[PDB]
């Protein structure tokens, strides 16, 4: 029995059991249940990492220090190991004899109490597989009689499905709800556990450092609950502090180290959490000017919104920023989104709203409900945001999206959360929602019918109101309009394209020179008013890249590494010189 | 001791190979071990990635002393799953052995246990983790981790996921170079620097079987063994790049020509090879070669696919022929998916869904996994007009970004696959007759049909619209001869000799071949006309022995006359 059962009280005297902090209310409920004449088996049910096991173990530590009531004093807590007991039986009666032997020891001592972690396991299959003589059946008479007291620990999901199916075992136990009271208790709790953790890593945790760790993990680390994750980040920080002192370096744990620790758990770029990159945010707008240009309001509006979020003035529950871009297609609305993620070094999430043109399509993003073919497959939107909490969400052709899709976005912008079929809570407040629409350009570009023209100042706004419901517009932080590209900007676009082609060739070892007049010709054919700058990529691709590639494999380019671009006035067709 | 060997002590004496690189990965493994709780590292990875070697490399580092003082005295022991399980063949006997082994490690503080392929075992794993007295290293496959570790909350909490990613191309050659002195000393012969770097590239592109780094180490050892074993080793003290390729042929199962470097050489011969087995339509094949020529030059975006092709005209326009020859010439496995079956919600789910079983998670997307199974394999699509417009939209997505994402989470890259399509819109319109008192030709341009059936964006992203010229009567006559030749060789084994008149070939050609159906009916027409009459005689009659056969036609009745001689 000693191999299977470990004495918590004896172990607590030596150490090992961490001191329990701020669980007086939870502990008091347990003692009341234990003092009952019958059914004196408290059951601790709570979410993962809520100190569920510590509460039971803490009772032993409290008894050792004599801080419990007189009735509780002079008691022993025993932690039963289900795995060890099941292992090595290899016979029909081996499990029963050892289990009955264990029960006899507890029954002999009235004061003795047992603790069974993950008690849900015994009810499913405690002793035998394919047989009804389980561990639960053995203890059901004893628990009802009151001879032995058993403490249990189970998760809410495990307690609801695996446990409570058998009413006989469930009634004997007394459900005790365990929930983290508040974030302030967690930092207070870590202070109590600070000596043990500090001693193991030979580090010291600053008061600011401990508080910073719990707060950072809450917002960024959603994999685990608040108490366990907070303890985990301060624990990992000690390891980082251990590696750095190769020879007599400082052993103190700084907030910067903790910031790096939370970044590793979430695998984020670590730029958002740290404030040392304020220079990049300060010059984010200037950098974007080198990128897609011609819209002073788009860059200014988007850059300003990100700055307030880092400054701490962003919406507590809503996304970092909600913006709708209404302008002609091909004017850079889409590129601003992909030119901001690269600059910010964060993931880019893009969804094709055109695909979601029917009512059935909306179920794909949130997943099918239980009992259906799509329950196994998680929602596309929920999976993407959960996988990438900090990223740029790009929705294109939002106007074409089914009305159902618009309804889903309402909760996203207002509450910052979306629930999938599985019921998981997807928190992606960090992402900046940006939508691109082409509805407005049609009204403004087209002239009013009739002899006398009419003002089109409000036609663009009217279209937005008709296409987008008012409730949707309210959540949007601002609506930015993209002005048509000027001739200079269009010519500038070609210069960037040749530079990109020249940069690609430079790596290969070929140098390209394009005549200034040739750039002007490419600009007119590549750029189209209705399509904006969309065809410029195809024109540059087919016209210039295809001929050069042939010579690169074999020809003048492979031997000489030189190429030139010219225009034929008579034929009005580009001519390329290879050397 | 007997059940689990001591890696740290083993490295002290030798045998363990020094680990080169993986400094960041090893650093994280050390960091978790130093943690007070949840200090059980998990070297998740794939077979051949070196996760087991990382454990062996970690043990070497501890004896070397490149670890913190706390980890300097730690000892790593690799649990032998086979040793404990073998010799018991009973439930619970194996557990008893594990309890004794665990007790020894528990007694000695600062003891590390390495359970290779831990997923195979997973009752006692949870208690050792919960106690925390001894930290444990676990190597599990990514697929097994989701199936076992993710499902079990207790196992996941104690174990920490350490991502082990395959090294880059440059990194893989560096690992071989770092380990090259050890190999050269072992067999006393060396490999050229060009040869080792080439081995990494040639192995992954052609074999595509175990792992990017694993294939490199396996291919180098295999090459040295062949060269050293051969008596020529005295004269040949270095390994040529071609020598490895010749040795790689044994583990390739394809001729040396395929394994031989043909990045630029294939272009010239492939054009000639297509014409060698295909007569005419030089312009059509030129379009195909031009698109793939761009990828070999490398002046293109990496994500963009290798090539985009299109085919139009009646069924059986050599789509299988040119594709099979193109795949053979490029040494890429031919993968063909037929859109003809994708006409229902269940069937259209097959591209990214797992029709075989919802319970089955390994297959995922059948079309998507096909690319994953063979990175360079060509994808042949046919009768795409039938498929729903919604299905066609997903094709546009992959064409733009050159990547796909499976429902299960797998990511497929289209940067290494050429996509070709086949359309048969022309036959439907041309066969129809105009509704008029006097009929008119209803033939229409193939390009016109592509525009109406498919969305404009598809044509824009597509590099060019390729229309294959229709079959010629001379080719049909040759096709008839090929089938007779195929039948002729088959008869020669049995001992029967068949002779066919030139007029007979022409006679079958007119009725058999059809414009709408191309050369498909001619094939079927040759089987029933020739196999059926001889078949009766072969079983019983004049052709039972001797096998003298003659084929001729009678002009008066316009019917084939078959002459059978006992011989």
């Amino acid at each position: 029995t000693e191999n299977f059962t470990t004495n918590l009280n004896q172990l607590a005297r030596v150490g090992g059991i961490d001191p329990l902090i701020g669980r007086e209310k939870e502990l008091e409920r347990a003692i009341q249940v234990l003092c009952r004449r019958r059914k004196n088996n408290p059951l601790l049910v709570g979410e993962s990492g809520v100190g569920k096991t510590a509460i039971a173990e803490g009772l032993a530590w409290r008894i050792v220090q004599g801080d419990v009531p007189e009735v509780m004093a002079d008691c022993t807590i025993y932690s039963l190991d289900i795995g060890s007991l099941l292992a090595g039986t290899k016979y029909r009666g081996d499990f029963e004899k050892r289990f009955k032997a264990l029960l006899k020891q507890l029954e002999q001592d009235t004061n003795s109490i047992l603790f069974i972690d993950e008690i849900h396991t015994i009810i499913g299959a405690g002793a035998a597989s394919g047989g009804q003589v389980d561990a639960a059946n053995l203890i059901k008479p004893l628990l009802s009689s009151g001879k032995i007291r058993v403490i249990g620990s189970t998760t809410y999901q495990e307690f609801s499905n695996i446990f409570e199916k058998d009413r006989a075992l469930a009634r004997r136990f007394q459900k005790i709800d365990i929930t983290e009271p508040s974030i302030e208790e967690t930092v207070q709790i870590i202070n109590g556990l600070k000596p043990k953790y500090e001693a193991h890593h030979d580090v010291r945790y600053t008061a600011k450092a401990v508080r910073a760790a719990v707060e950072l993990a809450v917002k960024y680390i959603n994999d685990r609950h608040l108490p366990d994750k907070a303890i985990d980040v301060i624990d990992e920080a000690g390891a980082r502090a251990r590696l750095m002192p190769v020879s007599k370096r400082k052993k103190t744990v700084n907030v910067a180290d903790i910031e790096s620790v939370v970044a590793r758990i979430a695998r984020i770029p670590e730029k958002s959490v740290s404030q040392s990159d304020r220079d990049t945010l300060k010059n984010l707008g200037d950098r974007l000017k080198m990128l897609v240009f011609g819209q002073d309001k788009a860059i200014e509006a988007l850059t300003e919104a990100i700055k307030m979020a880092r400054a701490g003035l962003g919406h507590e529950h809503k996304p970092v920023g909600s913006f709708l871009f209404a302008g002609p297609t091909g004017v850079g609305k889409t590129e601003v989104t992909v030119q901001l993620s690269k600059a910010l070094g964060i993931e880019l999430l893009r969804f094709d709203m055109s695909e979601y043109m029917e009512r059935h399509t909306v179920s794909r993003l949130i997943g099918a409900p239980p009992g259906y073919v799509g329950f196994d497959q998680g929602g596309l939107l929920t999976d993407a945001v959960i996988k990438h909490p900090h990223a740029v969400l790009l929705l294109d052709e939002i106007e074409k999206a089914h009305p159902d899709v618009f309804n889903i976005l309402l909760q996203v912008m207002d509450n910052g959360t979306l629930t999938d079929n599985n019921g998981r809570k997807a928190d992606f407040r960090n992402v900046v929602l940006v939508m691109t629409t082409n509805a407005g350009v049609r009204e403004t570009e087209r002239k009013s019918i009739g002899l006398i023209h009419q003002d089109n100042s409000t036609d663009a706004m009217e279209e937005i109101k008709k296409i987008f419901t008012p409730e949707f517009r309210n959540r949007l932080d601002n609506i930015i309009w993209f002005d048509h590209l000027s001739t200079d900007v269009i010519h500038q676009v070609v210069d960037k394209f040749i530079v990109e082609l020249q940069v690609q060739l430079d790596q290969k070892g070929v140098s390209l020179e394009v005549s200034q007049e040739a750039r002007n010709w490419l600009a007119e054919k590549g750029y189209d008013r209705a399509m904006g700058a969309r065809p410029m990529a195809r024109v540059i691709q087919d016209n210039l890249k295809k001929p050069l590639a042939n010579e690169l494999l074999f020809g003048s380019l492979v031997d000489g590494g030189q190429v030139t671009v010219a225009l034929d006035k008579e034929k009005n067709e580009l001519t390329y010189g290879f050397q | 001791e007997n059940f689990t060997t001591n890696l740290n002590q083993l490295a002290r004496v030798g045998g363990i190979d020094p680990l080169i690189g993986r400094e960041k990965e090893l650093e994280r493994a050390i960091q978790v071990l130093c943690r007070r709780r949840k200090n059980n590292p998990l070297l998740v990875g794939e077979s051949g990635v070196g996760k087991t070697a990382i454990a062996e490399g970690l043990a070497w580092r501890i004896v070397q002393g490149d670890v913190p003082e706390v980890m300097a005295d730690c000892t790593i022991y690799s649990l032998d799953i086979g040793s404990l399980l073998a010799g018991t063949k009973y439930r619970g006997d194996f557990e008893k052995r594990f309890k004794a082994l665990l007790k020894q490690l528990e007694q000695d503080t600062n003891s590390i246990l390495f359970i290779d392929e831990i997923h195979t075992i997973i009752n006692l794993i949870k208690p050792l983790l919960s106690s925390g007295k001894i930290r444990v290293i676990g190597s599990t496959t990514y697929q097994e981790f989701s199936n076992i570790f993710e499902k079990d909350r207790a196992l996941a909490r104690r174990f920490q996921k350490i991502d082990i990613t395959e090294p880059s191309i440059e990194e893989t050659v560096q690992i071989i170079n770092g380990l090259k002195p050890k190999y050269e000393a072992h067999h006393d012969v060396r490999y050229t620097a060009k040869a080792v770097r080439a081995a990494v590239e040639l192995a992954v592109k052609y074999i595509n079987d175990r792992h990017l780094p694993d294939k490199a180490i396996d291919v180098i050892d295999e090459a040295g063994a062949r060269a050293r074993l051969m008596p020529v080793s005295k004269r040949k003290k270095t390994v040529n790049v071609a020598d490895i390729e010749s040795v790689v042929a044994r583990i390739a199962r394809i001729p040396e020509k395929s394994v031989s470097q043909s990045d630029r050489d294939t272009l010239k011969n492939l054009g000639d090879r297509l014409k060698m087995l295909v007569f005419g339509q030089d312009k059509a094949i030129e379009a195909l070669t031009e698109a793939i020529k761009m990828a070999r030059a490398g002046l293109g975006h990496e994500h963009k696919p290798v090539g985009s092709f299109l085919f139009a005209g009646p069924t059986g326009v050599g789509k299988t022929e040119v594709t099979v020859q193109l795949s053979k010439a490029l040494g890429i496995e031919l993968l063909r998916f037929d859109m003809s079956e994708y006409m229902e919600r269940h069937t259209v789910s097959r591209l990214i869904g797992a029709p075989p079983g919802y319970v089955g998670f390994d297959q995922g997307g059948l079309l998507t996994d096909a690319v994953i199974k063979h990175p360079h394999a060509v994808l042949l699509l046919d009768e795409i007009e039938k498929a729903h417009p919604d299905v066609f939209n997903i094709l546009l997505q992959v064409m733009d970004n050159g990547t796909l994402t499976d429902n299960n989470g797998r990511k497929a890259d289209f940067r290494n696959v050429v996509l070709v399509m086949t359309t048969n819109a022309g036959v439907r319109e041309t066969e129809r007759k105009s509704i008029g008192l006097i009929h008119q030709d209803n033939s229409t341009d193939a390009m016109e049909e592509i525009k109406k059936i498919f969305t404009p964006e598809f044509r824009n992203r597509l590099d060019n619209i390729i229309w294959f010229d229709h079959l010629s009567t001379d080719v049909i006559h040759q096709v008839v001869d090929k089938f007779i030749v195929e039948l002729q060789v088959q008869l020669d084994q049995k001992g029967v000799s068949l002779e066919v008149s030139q007029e007979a070939r022409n006679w079958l050609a007119e009725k058999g071949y059809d414009r709408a159906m191309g050369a498909r009916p001619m094939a079927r027409v040759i089987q029933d006309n020739l196999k059926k009459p001889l078949a009766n005689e072969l079983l019983f009659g004049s052709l039972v022995d001797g096998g003298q056969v003659t084929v001729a036609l009678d002009k008066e009745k316009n019917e084939l006359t078959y002459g059978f001689q006992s011989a």
Partner: peptide, 18 residues
């Protein structure tokens, strides 16, 4: 489009030494 989800010990004999 509904989907349906479908869902060691032996006695021994002892021989005393002859």
């Amino acid at each position: 489009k509904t989907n349906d989800w479908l869902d060691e010990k032996v006695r021994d004999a002892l021989k005393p030494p002859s």
